[PDB]
Amino acid sequence: PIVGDIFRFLDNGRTGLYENYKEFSTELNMTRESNGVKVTINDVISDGRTLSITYSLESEQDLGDDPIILGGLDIMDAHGSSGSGKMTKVTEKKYVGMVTTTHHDSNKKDKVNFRWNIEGIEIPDRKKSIQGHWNFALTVKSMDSKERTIGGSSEKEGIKANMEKVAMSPVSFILYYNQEVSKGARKEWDSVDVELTVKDDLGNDYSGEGNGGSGNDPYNIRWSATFQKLNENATKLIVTPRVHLRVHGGVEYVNGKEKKIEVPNKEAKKKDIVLDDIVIDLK
Amino acid sequence: PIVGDIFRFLDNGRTGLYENYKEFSTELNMTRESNGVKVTINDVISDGRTLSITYSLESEQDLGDDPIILGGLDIMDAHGSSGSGKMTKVTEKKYVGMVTTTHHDSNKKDKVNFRWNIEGIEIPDRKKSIQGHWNFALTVKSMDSKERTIGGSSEKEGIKANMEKVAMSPVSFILYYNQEVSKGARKEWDSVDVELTVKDDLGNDYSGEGNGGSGNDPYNIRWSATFQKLNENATKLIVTPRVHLRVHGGVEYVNGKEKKIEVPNKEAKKKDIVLDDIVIDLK
Amino acid sequence: PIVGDIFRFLDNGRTGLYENYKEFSTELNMTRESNGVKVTINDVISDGRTLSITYSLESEQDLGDDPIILGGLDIMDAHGSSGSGKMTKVTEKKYVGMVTTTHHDSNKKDKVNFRWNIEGIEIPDRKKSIQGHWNFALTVKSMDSKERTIGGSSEKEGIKANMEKVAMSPVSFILYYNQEVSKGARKEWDSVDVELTVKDDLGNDYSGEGNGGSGNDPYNIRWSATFQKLNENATKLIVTPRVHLRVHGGVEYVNGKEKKIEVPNKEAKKKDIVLDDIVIDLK
């Protein structure tokens, strides 16, 4: 009850990644209640890399349209961490959502100890928050995954994508990789962002979702993304790096020398998208 | 100054619980000030079970109608914890409030070490927050209480309330207890909530307030509540468990078979309130 | 890029303090990215007393006018701490800001270990937050400063300002001090606030900014403030303590005894500003 599978309920309208999550999840339906607010933490699961959690939020009284969870899901001994969260209305007193955390410890964790510590629910519609504490402290065993360390790359505008690792669970698979930007390229561009699109030998496409990036400069970022149950008959992944370059503010028309149209800075120049292409042996 | 007794000022319009809190409180009026905002932490007190704190908030500039404290009151070595907070305007630059935290360590704590760590004041009226840090780190000695471990219960619809413990301070008293729900009952209901109402042998009623609940499933929840200075001539508590059952979304009219009115699901059925009744020896 | 020197960009319209901060800063441009939001932590610097950090915030999608950083900059082994933060729009997807934290460890710290842990970006304009994690864990070496322990004071209305310490970095200098309030004075006043204004032997004035205050009662507060690069030819600081006294709610007119105007409480009385004056040997 509420919604039967929160992972699929939340997986919209480009779709697929969460498809096998509940079945591989540990169901807990463990509850905390203060101040008219019952928080339940439903399905639980851990890549080894990323920990995803499913919850409900029920109240005595309207949360409205976009309640804000104050607090945080925290992994003990995460080295860095990144994350995401969604939430969706099912009734004006029921909400289901998902919180996701990715640690940046070099190796994956067999057991993830985490604490979900909520300190408040803001109800922006009603200008107000519900104060209190709702806490869960628990550790989860990770599903196993096969990781191979891989290489492979393509360059172009200065600006170049390196594969690092691949990891395959029963439910999903992960691509680890990073972007490098040259002194040339850094200079004409201030937001280089390298997306990968995934196919296998075989026809198929993979839906996926970033898990966050990191860097010591604004340009050389290690990233990783998670994608759909790898197809069992696939031999090879074909990876295309989409690169989205950007710099605007205001700007100029130069009706010039005549009668030709011309902007400083160059109006098509100064924020574009480019491509490349890599082959990974599932082996 | 500000308001003389924040505990009573905050205790509205069903009334009584906080009545003796200030007198048994440790007054500290310890202050922190950054960014135009002076936070004072006035009265302090600890059940052994729950820690309640009283504060003022003064600013240079309007908080408006419902300022939001970003941060948290945290008990060191709390096992779980729950809590509540209220705040009330006294001037457009003065606010008084109370924060309450309940730990779920099996035994009560003689000393409670806590940290009140504020990271911000949102001013939803003005769409804005005041960023900063205001921190108090301090430990409080608990008032003593007499706790007896008790049993006693009543069942009905599957769905059954068990007393666990009673604890009596000079200022207030606590009932520990839990609800159990059967496979039968769980199935027709998704929000069973067991409230207790308290009398003594003697006429009197007790105002009280939940301190939070906990469970490993959505149904079997350990709870506790706090109630008024127990009356000294009372011998026995008479406890009535109010049970509020719920499931709606949309719904149906069936003008049928004729001419009788009929909803799926059954429109009076599927969210009700029931009762029972228990006797506890103050002994 | 973005803005070249965030410290000066943020230093408005009484101006000077941040003027030499970037040059003495450690530039890091270390980045974290989740959920469409790239947070960069640009310039870094530490008084020994206070740690100031500069950052950018870039998004895929409007932050609007006053985004709210949920989370906190935290110093490990800070004894108490206080802080401040500003942020300013540069584009509807670019924001630059500064966060400042002051620890109240008796001695200054040669290395400050801190964690910047962001758990969310509220977008009050759009009623909404972006959930996730963006974390930086890093330690900074402090710039050296010359601290002398000093005394000196002036009294008046009961109510009296004591110098404690002075500390001079290459970029800025700090005055440590405290206010004391007598039983007389405490009684007619509930918000005594002692500001200092700074000159040297020499003509010059110093822009400065509180770093927060602390006290075990609402009145005797240790404070400190930071001011501009001390002028090299200065021999002595001339410090004037401005004292702002306050108590209003409502109030009265007494057309009386005739025809003279008279308010209870006394309408000019009950919130004023007074002064004093101290000489510190730079020695």
Coordinates of N, CA, C and O in Angstrom, one line a residue, chain C residues 11 23 49 63 65-66 75 84 94 96 106-107 118 133 140 157-158 160 167 191 223 235 246 250 256 260 280:
Chain C
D11 N 31.9 43.0 -1.3 CA 32.2 43.9 -0.3 C 31.6 45.3 -0.5 O 32.3 46.1 -1.1
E23 N 44.4 37.9 -2.7 CA 45.8 37.8 -3.0 C 46.5 36.9 -2.0 O 47.4 36.2 -2.3
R49 N 41.9 32.8 13.1 CA 40.7 33.0 13.9 C 39.5 32.6 13.1 O 38.6 31.9 13.6
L63 N 17.8 29.4 -10.2 CA 17.9 29.5 -8.8 C 17.0 30.7 -8.3 O 16.6 30.7 -7.1
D65 N 16.1 34.4 -7.1 CA 16.6 35.7 -6.5 C 17.4 35.5 -5.2 O 18.3 36.2 -4.9
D66 N 16.9 34.5 -4.4 CA 17.6 34.3 -3.2 C 17.7 32.8 -2.8 O 16.9 32.3 -1.9
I75 N 33.9 23.7 11.3 CA 35.3 23.5 11.7 C 35.4 22.3 12.8 O 34.7 22.3 13.8
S84 N 28.7 33.6 9.1 CA 27.9 34.5 8.2 C 28.0 33.9 6.8 O 28.9 33.2 6.5
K94 N 24.1 31.5 -12.4 CA 25.3 31.6 -11.7 C 25.2 32.5 -10.5 O 24.6 33.6 -10.6
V96 N 27.6 33.8 -7.1 CA 28.8 33.7 -6.3 C 28.5 34.1 -4.8 O 27.7 34.9 -4.6
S106 N 40.1 29.2 22.5 CA 41.0 30.2 23.1 C 42.2 30.6 22.2 O 42.4 31.7 22.0
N107 N 43.0 29.6 21.7 CA 44.0 29.9 20.8 C 43.6 29.7 19.3 O 42.7 28.9 19.0
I118 N 26.8 20.3 1.9 CA 25.5 20.9 1.5 C 24.5 19.9 1.2 O 24.8 18.9 0.6
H133 N 23.6 15.9 -2.2 CA 24.8 16.1 -1.4 C 25.9 16.7 -2.2 O 26.3 16.3 -3.3
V140 N 43.0 23.8 5.9 CA 43.8 24.9 5.5 C 44.8 25.4 6.5 O 44.5 25.6 7.7
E157 N 27.3 54.0 31.8 CA 26.0 53.9 32.4 C 25.9 52.6 33.2 O 24.8 52.2 33.5
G158 N 27.0 51.9 33.4 CA 26.9 50.6 34.2 C 27.5 49.4 33.5 O 27.2 48.3 33.9
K160 N 30.1 48.8 30.1 CA 31.5 49.1 30.2 C 32.2 48.2 29.3 O 31.9 47.1 29.3
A167 N 45.0 41.4 17.1 CA 45.8 40.4 16.2 C 45.9 40.9 14.7 O 45.0 41.2 14.1
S191 N 18.6 44.8 25.9 CA 19.4 44.6 24.7 C 20.6 45.6 24.6 O 20.5 46.5 23.8
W223 N 33.1 39.4 22.3 CA 32.9 39.6 20.9 C 34.2 39.7 20.3 O 35.3 39.8 20.9
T235 N 50.8 54.1 14.9 CA 51.3 53.9 16.2 C 50.3 53.4 17.3 O 50.6 52.6 18.2
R246 N 18.2 49.2 24.3 CA 16.8 49.0 23.8 C 15.9 48.3 24.9 O 16.5 47.8 25.8
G250 N 2.9 47.8 22.9 CA 2.3 49.1 22.8 C 2.7 50.0 23.9 O 3.7 49.8 24.6
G256 N -1.3 65.8 29.6 CA -1.1 65.8 31.1 C 0.1 66.6 31.5 O 1.0 66.9 30.7
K260 N 1.2 68.9 28.5 CA 2.5 68.4 28.1 C 2.5 66.9 27.7 O 1.7 66.2 28.3
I280 N 44.9 52.2 22.3 CA 45.7 51.0 22.2 C 47.0 51.3 21.5 O 47.1 51.8 20.4

